[PDB]
Subunit: 103 residues, 8 copies
C-alpha cells in the first residue's frame, strides 16, 4: 500500500467550519473517488488550524487515476469553490507502511 499524508493550514479559527462543510458536501465524493480514508484529523499541538488526512492507495498509478477522477467531478469542483478560501497552504508526503503496520 502507498499512503499519502496531506496537511492543510487553514485560516485561524476556521477548522470547525471547514470540517462541517467538508462532511456535508465533500466527504462522500472524495472518499468515493479516492477509496480508502485512513484518518482525518485536526491539530491540538504544533501549528494550530491544521487538518491532516491519510489516504491509502494500491499504487501511485491508481492514486493518479483516482485523483483525476475526483478533480474532474463537477460536484467536487463546486465544493472546492465553497471551501477553498479557508485554505492558506497545502503540503503532502508519501509513506510506506512497515510490514507489521495494521490493516
Amino acid at each position: 500500500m502507498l499512503v499519502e499524508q496531506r496537511t492543510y493550514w487553514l485560516k485561524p479559527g476556521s477548522v470547525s467550519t471547514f470540517l462541517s462543510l467538508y462532511e456535508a458536501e465533500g466527504l462522500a465524493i472524495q472518499a468515493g473517488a479516492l477509496g480508502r480514508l485512513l484518518g482525518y484529523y485536526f491539530s491540538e499541538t504544533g501549528d494550530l488550524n491544521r487538518v491532516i488526512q491519510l489516504w491509502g492507495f494500491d499504487s501511485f498509478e491508481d492514486r493518479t487515476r483516482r485523483k483525476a477522477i475526483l478533480s474532474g467531478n463537477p460536484q467536487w469542483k463546486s465544493f472546492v469553490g465553497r471551501a477553498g478560501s479557508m485554505i492558506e497552504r497545502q503540503s503532502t508526503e508519501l509513506l510506506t507502511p512497515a510490514p507489521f503496520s495494521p490493516v
Copy 2:
C-alpha cells in the same frame, strides 16, 4: 480518542535496520503497553530516513499511564539501549479525529 503522531529522524541508511530490530524486539512490548497502533510508516518523500507512528489513546491521562508503564519495562529499556543510537531527533504532536474519521 486522542491521537499521537510521533516522528523519528534516523541516521541515513538505517531505516530497514531499525524496523527489523523494532519488529523483533520492541513491537510486542510497546504495542502491549500503549494499546492501539494506528499506523507505522517510513518516509518516501520529504525528509528521508523518517519513521512515523500513530497511536490512539482513550485520553491524555491514559497515555501518561501507559507511557510510564512502557518506560519502566526492563525489556523495553534493553531494546532502547540497542536501537537508540540510530535515532537522531524526535518530535511528536497530538491530533483529534474528525467525527467522520474511521474506526
Copy 3:
C-alpha cells in the same frame, strides 16, 4: 502541573493594539476560565509581532474542560470577533516543569 505555551503571530505593527484590546475585553474572561496565567509577553527578538502566553493547568483533562468553557462564553466569542483579524498564525506546545521550577 501541565504548562501550555501558545504563540500568535500578528499582523505587522498590531501588537500594541492587540494587547490593549485584550486587556480591556479578553483578559478577565480568559483568565477567569483558564485559571493560572504564568506569563504573557511580546517578542523583542526573533520573529517580531509575536505574542506568547504560558498557562498552567492541573491536568490535560482540566485544560480541556476550561477551554470548552471559554470557547462557549458569549462575551469571549464577541472579543474573538473583534480581535481575531490581527492573528495570522497560531501554534502551541505542552511543557512539563522540572521538579525545581518555581511555584
Copy 4:
C-alpha cells in the same frame, strides 16, 4: 523586566539525566548568579528532548553583568564540562511582559 527564553536541544533520551545533573550541580550556582528563574521545563510536544528556561532581568545591562559573573565561575565551568556533551543546539530570545502579565 526583560525576559529571556532559552531553549536547548539535547541528545535523544538525555533529558532526565541532564535535569538531575543540573539540579545537583548547576542550579544553585546559575540561579545565584542570574537572579530570577521564572520557569524551567522540558517539552512534551513538538521537538522532544528540549529543555526550556525563562529568566527575568532588571535590564539588558544587568543580564550582561550577571552572565559574565556566571561564565567566570570556576564551579560553573566544571558543571558545563560535565553536562555540555548532552547539548546539541542552543537558541535564545528576548521578550517583554505585557503590563498585566503576573509578578
Copy 5:
C-alpha cells in the same frame, strides 16, 4: 555554467492557471531574454502549489545582463501585472554542475 533554481509558492489551486497564462504570454519573452531553460516544473510532494524553474547562464555577469533586459521589457511588465497576484512567495538559489552533469 551557472545554474539558477527559482521557486514560486502560488495561491492554493492556482498552478494550472499560472502555467497556462505563462505559456501563452510569458514563456517566449522570458526564454528569449534569459537564454537556456533547463526545466520548469510543479510540485507533486512537499509544499504543494510550487512552480520550480531551472535556468542556465554562461556567467553571473550574463545573468545580470539578461535579467535587466527582461525586467525592462514592456510586454514582460504587462504579463507580470496579469500573473503576479498568484505569487505568494519567491526564492532562488545558485548551483554549479558537477563535471559529469549532462549537457
Copy 6:
C-alpha cells in the same frame, strides 16, 4: 557595540518601491534617530523580496531610547502608514562584533 540585524519580508515585486519610498521619506528620520546605519540591503538569493538592515548601538539601553524616540516621531508615523502595507513579516537579531571586526 551592539549590532542589530533586521529583516523585512515584503510583498513580491515591491522591493524597489519600498526602497524608493524609504529613501525619500524615512531614511533621514530613521538614521537621525537611531544613529549608525551599518548596511541596508536587498536579497539576491534565498528568500527574495527581503530587505535587510544592520544598525550599530552603543548599548541596548541606548537602542531602547532611540527606538522610542523614532516610534513617537509624527513624521515617522506618517511614513510607516504609507509604507507599511508592503511589509508581510519582520524579524530581528542581536549580534556582537568580533574584536577584529572593522570600525
Copy 7:
C-alpha cells in the same frame, strides 16, 4: 515524465571529495540502473555542502523497479559503504514537468 529532485546535506568541506568518489565509483552504476540523469549539482548559495540531483522516470512504478535494482547491486552497496559517512541528511521530492519544459 516523473521527475525526482534529491538533496543530500554533506559534512562541511566534503563536497569535492564526495563528487570525485561518486564519479569514479558510483555514477556509472547509478545512471545505468536509474536511466535518465537530468542534473547533478552542488550548492553555491543557501545551505552550503548540498548536492542536488534530478532524475527522470517514465513512471513511479518504473522508479520503484529501478531503485530496487540499484539497491540490490553489490557494487552499489560497496560504494554506499565508502561514501555514506559524508552524508548527514537526505530529502527528496517528486515534480511534474510543465508541458513546455524541455526534452
Copy 8:
C-alpha cells in the same frame, strides 16, 4: 558592490575558541585574499553559536577569483584543518546594497 553574508553554526560553546584561532591564524590570510571585510559577528539571540560574516566584492567574477586564490593557499588549508571540526553547518547568501547604504 556584491555583498556576501555567510553564517557558520558552530559546536555549542566553541565560539570564543573559533574566533581566537581565526584571528591568530586565518584572518590575515582570508582578508588578504578576499579584500573587503564588512563585518564579523557572533550571535547573541536566535540560534546561539553562530558566526556571521559579511564580505564586499566588486563583482561575482572577482569573488570567484578571490575565493579560488584563498582555497588554494597552503596556509589557509592548514588553518581550515585546525579550525574545521568546530563547524557544524554553513550557509551563505548574496545581497545588493541600497543606493543610500554606507561606504
